[PDB]
């Protein structure tokens, strides 16, 4: 169907959206449901909670992915610690492009939560991030960003050659060339009228990066003052470097 082998292989590693939104969703009910009122059920904090869950999901996806599954645990940890927030942001973005609308945010659980709302129960420093993310959503919606392209970017974000002290550097650099070539082949063959979808798609990664940077600083700032419950995974990841 004019779809390069590599990409079809990358699509088989994708999780099944519904079963993921269900699991996570459940986990949250199983949460509140317990401490019915005494604790902290504020807005923002609920986000961190799902972000932490969206994270286990990313780890799961990577763990079962075609080339990543051949790396030793040390390298897998290095690659994941280097892009965990980018994968989150990318994920959130592709979800809005594929299942979002006007001014409504489609959460990982499957719940739409009017953009308007979210912006009224959160601080501006958070509001600004979300909005930075929503700008990309608009661009990517105009570029006809599809799932096949979405999986290619996940691998381009995960298999970064700019990570140092990797045991098997050649493999990471191999995957990287394997995917770029695939994404190029695909976008020109499937969207030939769009002169530079390829170039345009790649321009998004440094933007996704710069956003995950502000994201992490905000999170870190909110954590240094009990404004974040606890997410052994969110916080752990957050303390891989920290400066």
């Amino acid at each position: 169907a004019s779809i390069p082998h590599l990409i079809l292989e990358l699509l088989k590693c994708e999780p099944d959206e519904p079963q993921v939104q269900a699991k996570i969703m459940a986990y949250l009910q199983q949460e509140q449901s317990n401490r019915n009122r005494q604790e902290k059920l504020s807005a923002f904090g609920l986000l961190c909670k799902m972000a932490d869950q969206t994270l286990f999901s990313i780890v799961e996806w990577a763990r079962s992915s075609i080339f990543f599954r051949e790396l030793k645990v040390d390298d897998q940890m290095k690659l994941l610690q280097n892009c965990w927030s980018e994968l989150l942001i990318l994920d959130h973005i592709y979800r809005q492009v594929a299942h979002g609308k006007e001014g409504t945010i489609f959460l990982v659980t499957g719940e739409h939560v009017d953009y308007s709302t979210i912006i009224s129960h959160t601080e501006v420093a958070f509001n600004n991030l979300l909005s930075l993310a929503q700008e990309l959503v608009v661009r990517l919606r105009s570029l006809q960003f599809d799932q096949r392209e979405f999986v290619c970017l996940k691998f381009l974000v995960l298999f970064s050659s700019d990570v140092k002290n990797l045991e098997n550097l050649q493999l990471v650099e191999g995957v990287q060339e394997q995917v770029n070539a695939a994404l190029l082949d695909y976008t020109v063959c499937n969207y030939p009228q769009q002169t530079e979808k390829f170039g345009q798609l790649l321009l998004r990664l440094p933007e996704i990066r710069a956003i995950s940077k502000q994201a992490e600083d905000y999170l870190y700032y909110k954590h240094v003052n009990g404004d974040v419950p606890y997410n052994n995974l969110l916080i752990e990841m957050l303390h891989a470097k920290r400066a």
């Binding site: 897998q76 940890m77 752990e236 990841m237």
Partner: peptide
């Protein structure tokens, strides 16, 4: 460092 939770998840 020796990423604890991530390790439990990756091994």
């Amino acid at each position: 460092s020796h990423p604890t939770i991530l390790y439990t998840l990756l091994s």
